[model samples]
Target: GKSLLLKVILLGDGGVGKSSLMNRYVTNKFDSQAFHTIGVEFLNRDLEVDGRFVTLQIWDTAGQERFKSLRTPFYRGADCCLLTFSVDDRQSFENLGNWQKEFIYYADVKDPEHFPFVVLGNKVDKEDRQVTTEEAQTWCMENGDYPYLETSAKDDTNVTVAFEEAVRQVLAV
Candidate 1:
């Protein structure tokens, strides 16, 4: 509770498994019912990275078109942003550019070139994969060279590691 807080936001299209990723990483449980996020829902979790204790304020956003009236101005002051995509969804991966632009535009990041961003390709447990790892690697390498991790919230694969790496990414900045 006394640790420093890192505001981390998850940006991606709906059904890309952002809620599942946050829930699985924070509480070790996955609930499909919480799939539809409002403006911006967040959870505070304590995390230790490289011997430094920090609180990760993980944020999820969706249903903006439906809940546009109750939108929250919570984009600023972000310590890190997670540009999420699903390997099974090619559109989501391609839309990563929009997410990045929106976050940078709304977050009002001062030094974006050095800002910490971690790309997460979720739902790796699925069989019908569309985006290849090489493609993602090249995309990340070109687009700010963010650290990318393929994860599956259902099987608890790379969930913790991804968040911890995000913490490391922000802490390093």
Candidate 2:
């Protein structure tokens, strides 16, 4: 089979560990000082799954409202969307809906009900978790049963699983 190229976008509030998640998944290392993505930053990784090679071009977008206009253009033609939130920040978790709406609008996705969207509750390693797994799972179930994962980029926990699940969902579509 021919290889596949997937354009994946990561959306979340500032300081939600978007860069950390990308760095951990692409390079297998965690940087505490992973700077906030100013506009948009991306990295690609090739993986063999189910006898198929997939190259995921993951884009990490700036979460600040000031950069929202700049980030939406990159959402165009996204194969999948990863709506991430920091478990330690309640506001980040609450803003997931806004991020999803922004992506759907900018991506010009006709059927948002069937769009491939993944919910990632990042920074789960922090002891100050404000969003519980049950809460996030409930939100996912409410929103078209979007696959949800608890990821700790710092600990490299579930980071790969989250990305793999995103790719799998994209392939299924």
Candidate 3:
């Protein structure tokens, strides 16, 4: 079997739980009060999928305005991208268009065919979650141009599935 390497960039608004989700998936630990990612953090995880050894290089970036300009460079050479939003925060979901626009600006089409992008709606475990699955899916269909997944980073729910599904798609490409 062949080996697949996937470089994934996680992007979203500030405080959207991108890092938290990454931590839960990669470390299998949950923290109620995780701080924001300062600049960028890279993590590698090897997964065996259907007899193929897939190496996932994950880049987690800070979402503050100061770091917004670094998105293109941060996303450079990525095989797949995960754009996350907090279901508890409507504003984060509302910024999906902006994130997509930035991605289009940075990523050229020739990089690869069948680019796998997963729209992650995080923080679903919150009792006051604001974004509905249907609303998020419709928005993804209209703007993000990717499959949407509702996840709860706090509970480690769908954290791995989202990444695994995206990795499988990327490897199949």
Candidate 4:
């Protein structure tokens, strides 16, 4: 059977480890010391799920405040979006609302029901975490029906499950 192409974009505030999380999940590897992502980076993976081969083109976006103006183009043709935030950073979680608003502005206003989103609380390995899981889930439930996951890129926790679940749900739609 022919493979389906899934374009997934990662969005979040800077220093949230979006690139690191993608590297850990897509490559099953992570670097403890890594520099910042100036613009964007991408990874391509071939996944076999439910008897279908799917090619996932994952784009890891830069989260600097200056890059906010560049997000609309990045949101185009995205089958699913992974919204990330550092579990230890309260500001990152608070800025999620801005990211969501930008996406909704450029996305299909009429067909909002079909858009799939996964809110990820990254960097859970750190003991000094600010946002709790309950708080995140409560906000997510109130704003939209998108699912949330707490992940630790350092420990490779919840990385695969989160990505897999997002792909599965998007494919089912």
Candidate 5:
């Protein structure tokens, strides 16, 4: 089979479940007590997308303010980016724009307007949701109509879909 290597990065505020999402998608498991990423960490998965094998090099970045400098460097040359927010955390949702800006600036993507950015509203399994799906959808539409998906890493809902959709977008570009 044919093969392709794609670099993907996950960015969001601390405790937004970026690591959970990555673990769920790559390993089909989630750890509730997973430790926070210090600077950056990565995992690779070879997936069959459209009958072709694609190795996705997925990078998980630390969301702490002190790690901002270390994280931005990994954003360079990213093929796709996932900007995640916790549905129960309003501040994380609000910080989506900042994450997006940082990615575009550091990635040095030629076309900032149409970059492959997927907005993920995670922790949808939680009952006390502070950020509604409609609110996230609206923000995605306003921000270049980014593909938005509500995911629950805990329950595995939309975890595969989110990553697959990101790869599809990258392929389409």
Candidate 6:
């Protein structure tokens, strides 16, 4: 086979389940009692994509506002970025693009027109969804054309699919 490495990131406001998404994808479990620590933390997983060895270096940035300056600098050299927001939180949804811009600007990514981005709405297990699939897909269709997915950490629904989709994307690029 072959070998490759990809740097992936999770961008969202505080309490948007970004860390839960990270744990669910990497360890296949969710920790209700434990959240994030500080600064930036990450996990790793390896998979064979396109008949080759691929390493996924996934990142979970601290959600607090104080770490705003600390997190962006780490965004540099990223390959795939997940724009995450809670389905029940409208504020997180509204700030989605700004977070994306932060990743682009901070990462200093050149030619972001074709950057791999996955728009994710986490916590879909909730009864209330402040944002819908149509709205999200429309936003994706409207802005830079990304793959939009709805995921739930509690139910373990669409979690794997989203990450695999991200893998496929970075591999494609």
lDDT of 3 by residue, 51-134 (tens): 678888888988776877665677768888888899989999998777766765677646433567789999888899888999
Better of 2 and 3 by lDDT: 2
Ranking 1 against 3 by TM-score, winner: 1
**C-alpha RMSD for every candidate:** 1.9, 1.0, 2.1, 1.6, 1.0, 1.4
TM accuracy, model 4: 0.92
TM-score of model number 6: 0.94
In candidate 1 the C-alpha lDDT for residue 158 amounts to 94
Name the candidate that leads on lDDT: 5
Q: Tell me the tens digit of each residue's lDDT in model 2 across 11-72.
A: 99999988899999999998887776779988989998777899999999998899988898
TM-score of 2: 0.97
Model 6, residue 42: distance off in Å is 1.5
lDDT of 1 by residue, 1-173 (tens): 47988888888887889889988988889875664777778899997888888989998778234653443367787899889999999999999998888788878888989999999999899999999999998999999989999999999999999999988998786
Ten-residue segment with the worst summed lDDT in candidate 2?
A: 29-38
lDDT of 3: 0.81
For 82-140, candidate 5 gives per-residue lDDT tens digits of 99999999999999999998888888988988789999999999999998889899999
Measured by TM-score, how close is model 5 to the native structure?
A: 0.97
Q: How do the predictions measure up, each by TM-score?
A: 0.93, 0.97, 0.90, 0.92, 0.97, 0.94
Error of 6 at 74 (Å): 0.9
